[PDB]
Ligand binder design. Sequence first.
Ligand SMILES: Nc1ncnc2c1ncn2[C@@H]1O[C@H](CSCC[C@H](N)C(=O)O)[C@@H](O)[C@H]1O
Lengths: 25, 61, 72, 118, 235
Amino acid sequence: PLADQILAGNAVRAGVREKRRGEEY
Amino acid sequence: PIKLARVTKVLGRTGSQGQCTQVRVEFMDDTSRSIIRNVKGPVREGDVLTLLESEREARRL
Amino acid sequence: DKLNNLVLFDKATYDKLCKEVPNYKLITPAVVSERLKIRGSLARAALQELLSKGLIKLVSKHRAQVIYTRNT
Amino acid sequence: MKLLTHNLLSSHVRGVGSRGFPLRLQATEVRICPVEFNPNFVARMIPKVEWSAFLEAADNLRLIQVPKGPVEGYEENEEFLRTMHHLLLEVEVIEGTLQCPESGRMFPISRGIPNMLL
Amino acid sequence: RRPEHGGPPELFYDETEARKYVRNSRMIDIQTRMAGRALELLYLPENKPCYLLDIGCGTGLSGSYLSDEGHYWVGLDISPAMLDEAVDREIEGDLLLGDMGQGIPFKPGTFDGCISISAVQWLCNANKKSENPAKRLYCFFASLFSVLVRGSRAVLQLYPENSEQLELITTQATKAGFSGGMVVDYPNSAKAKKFYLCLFSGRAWVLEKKERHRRQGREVRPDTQYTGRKRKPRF
RNA sequence: UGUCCUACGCCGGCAGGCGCGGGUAACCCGUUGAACCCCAUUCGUGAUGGGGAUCGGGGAUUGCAAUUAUUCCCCAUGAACGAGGAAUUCCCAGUAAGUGCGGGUCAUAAGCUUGCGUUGAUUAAGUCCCUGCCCUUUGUACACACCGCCCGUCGCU
Ligand SMILES: Nc1ncnc2c1ncn2[C@@H]1O[C@H](CSCC[C@H](N)C(=O)O)[C@@H](O)[C@H]1O
């Protein structure tokens, strides 16, 4: 859709990215 | 005139190096105006922001 | 420029200490030497003189920082 | 600010290119800075100096006692060259203004450097 | 990191940065060391005092090197703090305050040469919305080409951060009519790699047939030393 | 850590000597009395009681042998260095960094590589802009390629 394509080109993608970084007895 | 705004939700991080995040804010004097802004540093929901000029809506791809 | 701070009190500045330094609201070896233009060796040696004469209250004693105060 | 400098200065305004030269001078303090005399320098700066602007600027600087014509030589007229060495490279304008003809923009001297900014 | 990341030159070179620039042992060494190479790089005749332009003079270290070699000069700089330090050092030449992006305010055909030591790369970044790097570079070199006399030379030392700033300076330089090149001293070193814009105003045929037959898949004789050799003269 | 680690007594100011013991080792070194750290004193913005190079004279130890100083100690000399125009490394929590302590090489070096504890944070929980690597589509832009100009003027044999 045109409005979907415009709004995708106006906002920023976000979300999925997994960064793997980094007592009883 | 200085203006205070409370964020509502974080849209995502923008910029070439991801040095900013884009967040939707709502005001304190009247909870009707909702403009979109760019901020740098760690931002979460409920933060209160000091906007120097509350006229223009920020934009980046 | 270069500092030529005096190492011993002359007659003019010695009077200036004994009628003005016990009314600053803060007396310290380092703040005395900036304004009276004396070495810090005498800037602390002049204050133990004033402490023994009872013109100054002591606030803290430390090897790094010494803090002094007016009487009233 | 040397007398040789403004006599080679112009105006960098976009509208005035390139007929803004010369600029009017004013002074309220003048100091004298001694500069080493090289006869090879001034001899090849006489063809480059514009003399008509030099008279009126000395007229702005209230001084009249100048050579009225091109003092060109083979470094032999020491009496003329030292006087203009006093004129060109030794009279300093400590405080004053510049007047642009076609814009009227101020360029104030403040001890002793003019500013040519927007 | 780099000084250009700090901001505009008028605010970065403030009063406190001007002091520690003067008493900077590395700065006193290398600023005059490059000005020695840069004055030597414009091939001006010896035993002849010339009138030079010190664009981006700053403290006047490069200005003092000209005066000690018997030349005369004027300096143009944008920050008043580095100009105040130049006055206190009792320099010889004249000093001018202004931005080289707005134009050099002299009559055409004035200077016998222009000297530049680490001032140029401050134009590749624009820290105001009114400022544009392309127009500020062009307004510099177009005004420089007017003011420099014909046949003279301008030598420019600059500190590029990537390959794009070298390109973007060069195309603006060559569009104003300058001709010359880039002089890189020690082009493959690190500490001594200095950039200088110098600018001035004017049998085998048998083999391919065998391999073509090899492509066609037919049986061929193996490639050896005796492939193309005339056996004997032909009568 | 070790049969080379050392305890203790005596002598010299120090490097260092003489004697006598423990330990093949959760048994002796060793309650491993480490350094930064902590508390008092002197110094007082001064190339200074910061900094220690480079030197002069002497003493002691290992070695067949110390000269071009093996190493260590004492007294004297007190250079540059005033936080580094600009190239670039490593790093996300007991981590970086400050600080000391130990094994392989080793008649004696200290100098490489490895570890260990102690004091202990600023920033970040992201991005594909720079660099490098790996996938998908494609060979449509540029370049290659094709066609053209292929620099002109006069002068004699
Ligand atoms: N846009 C601009 N126009 C004119 N001068 C500028 C400028 N941007 C930066 N500069 C000047 O460039 C200078 C760099 S400091 C280097 C100056 C000289 N090499 C010296 O060491 O003495 C600064 O003084 C700054 O004032």
